[PDB]
Amino acid sequence: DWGYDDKNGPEQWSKLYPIANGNNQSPVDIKTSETKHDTSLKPISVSYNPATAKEIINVGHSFHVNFEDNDNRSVLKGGPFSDSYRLFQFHFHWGSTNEHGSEHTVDGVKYSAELHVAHWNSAKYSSLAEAASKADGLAVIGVLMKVGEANPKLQKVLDALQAIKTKGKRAPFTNFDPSTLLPSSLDFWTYPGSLTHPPLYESVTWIICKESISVSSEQLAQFRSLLSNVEGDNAVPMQHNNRPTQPLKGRTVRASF
Numbered sequence: 203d204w205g206y207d208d209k210n211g212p213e214q215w216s217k218l219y220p221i222a223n224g225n226n227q228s229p230v231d232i233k234t235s236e237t238k239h240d241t242s243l244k245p246i247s248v249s250y251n252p253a254t255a256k257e258i259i260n261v262g263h264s265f266h267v268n269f270e271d272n273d274n275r276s277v278l279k280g281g282p283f284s285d286s287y288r289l290f291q292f293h294f295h296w297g298s299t300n301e302h303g304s305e306h307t308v309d310g311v312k313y314s315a316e317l318h319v320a321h322w323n324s325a326k327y328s329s330l331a332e333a334a335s336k337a338d339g340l341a342v343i344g345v346l347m348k349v350g351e352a353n354p355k356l357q358k359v360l361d362a363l364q365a366i367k368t369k370g371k372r373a374p375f376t377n378f379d380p381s382t383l384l385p386s387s388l389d390f391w392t393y394p395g396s397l398t399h400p401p402l403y404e405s406v407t408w409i410i411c412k413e414s415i416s417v418s419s420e421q422l423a424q425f426r427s428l429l430s431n432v433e434g435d436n437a438v439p440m441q442h443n444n445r446p447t448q449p450l451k452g453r454t455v456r457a458s459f
C-alpha cells in the first residue's frame with residue numbers, strides 16, 4: 203500500500219500514518235552550529251558475532267539483512283544508552299541519482315546512500331515486536347555513504363543480491379559481522395526520532411556517524427538494479443527509498459565530539 207512513488211510515497215504517508223506529521227520524525231538535517239556537545243556521552247561499543255547473520259530478503263522497497271536475535275551474541279552499548287541493544291538487521295537507503303540518496307543530511311549536504319544498523323532494547327523488552335513501538339525500544343546507527351572509491355567491505359552483500367532479485371525472494375546470509383562496514387571513528391551525533399518509513403513509530407534513538415564510508419557509482423547501480431516486482435511481472439527497478447528530512451520541532455541533536 204505504501205512505497206516511494208508519487209501516489210504512495212513520503213508526501214502521502216500521513217493519510218494512512220498520521221504520526222508522519224509528529225514531533226519526533228526522522229530523518230533530520232544535522233546543523234552542526236546548533237548541536238550540543240554532551241560530556242556524559244560514552245563511546246559507542248559494538249560487539250557482533252558473525253554467526254548471528256541469518257538471511258537476506260527483498261522487501262519490495264529495499265533489502266534487509268537479518269540476524270538471529272534470540273540472545274546477546276550481537277550487541278550495541280555505550281553512547282547515550284544505559285541498556286544493551288540487540289542487533290537485528292542492517293539495510294541501506296539510496297536515491298535515483300548519486301546527488302541524493304542519504305536520509306540524514308549534514309549542514310544541508312546530501313550523500314549518495316546511507317547504512318542503517320538496527321537494534322532493539324533486550325534489557326526492557328522481550329522481542330522486536332514488543333520493542334518497536336516503545337520510545338526506548340530501538341537504536342539505529344546511521345552511516346552516510348559518500349560516492350567515490352569502491353568499498354570492498356560491501357562485497358558479500360552485493361554478491362548476494364543476484365539471489366534475491368524480485369520481491370519476496372530470500373536467501374541464507376551467514377558468517378558476517380556488520381561492524382566491518384562502520385567507519386574507523388565512531389564519533390557521533392544522537393537525537394530522538396523515528397523509523398524513516400511506515401509504520402514511522404517514534405521509537406528510535408539515532409546514532410549518526412561523523413565519518414562517512416565510501417561507495418562507488420557502480421555499487422549504487424547494483425542497489426538500483428534490484429526489482430520491486432514479483433517474479434514474472436514487468437520489471438520495476440528500486441530506483442530510490444530515501445525519505446526527505448523532517449522538522450526538528452524543538453529537539454536537540456547532541457554531539458559526542
Ligand SMILES: CCCCNC(=O)Nc1ccc(S(N)(=O)=O)cc1
Nearest residue numbers: 291318320334342396397398399401
Ligand atoms: C515495526 C517493526 C520494525 C520494522 N522494521 C524492520 O524490520 N526494519 C527497520 C525498518 C526501518 C528502520 S530505519 N530506516 O532504520 O528507520 C529500521 C528498521
Ligand SMILES: [Zn+2]
Nearest residue numbers: 293295318398
Ligand atoms: Zn533505514
